[PDB]
């Protein structure tokens, strides 16, 4: 299995998945995801319920955000989970906008768990914001999930800031 240091050195979003669904040997399942602007409290996206790809359709105002709060709920299968860690790398074209390295902590088996994380946005020039709005899906992320420094899940996303 891939270690955090291997993906922390990646300069580009991966072409393909770095692991298989069967690599999720803890049966971690994401059951709710919510993000909110911590400036206004406005909920920006909420969802509750293969499935390793999400396409986000946001508005230009999204790229004026500074601080966004994420709440994640997940269930865990019958094994204990220690040092649950997500490295999420946001790219525009072929370069890193920002790396996020979040601690999801310890989980007991068959448990339902909630975590709160804060995304502080990178500083974006006006030219980069316009490029991102006018190049939908050129902004892309890899979310790499590690338990005890072993890669168990890889989720992908892309982003448009094009919406009405």
């Amino acid at each position: 299995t891939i270690r955090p240091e291997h993906v922390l050195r990646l300069s580009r979003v991966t072409e393909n998945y770095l692991c298989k669904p069967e690599d999720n040997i803890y049966s971690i399942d994401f059951t709710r995801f919510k993000i909110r602007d911590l400036e206004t409290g406005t909920v920006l996206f909420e969802i509750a319920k293969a499935g390793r790809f999400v396409r986000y359709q946001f508005t230009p105002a999204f790229l004026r955000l500074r601080t966004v709060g994420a709440t994640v709920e997940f269930t865990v299968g019958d094994k204990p989970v220690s040092n649950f860690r997500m490295i999420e790398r946001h790219y525009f074209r072929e370069h890193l906008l920002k790396n996020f390295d979040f601690d999801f902590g310890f989980c007991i088996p068959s448990s339902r768990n909630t975590c709160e994380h804060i995304y502080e946005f990178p500083q974006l020039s006006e030219d980069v914001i316009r490029l991102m709005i006018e190049n939908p899906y050129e902004t892309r992320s890899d979310s790499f999930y590690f338990v005890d420094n072993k890669l168990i899940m890889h989720n992908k996303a892309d982003y448009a800031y094009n919406g009405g």
Partner: peptide, 5 residues
């Protein structure tokens, strides 16, 4: 990525 179901 946590938005994936």
């Amino acid at each position: 990525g946590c938005g994936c179901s």
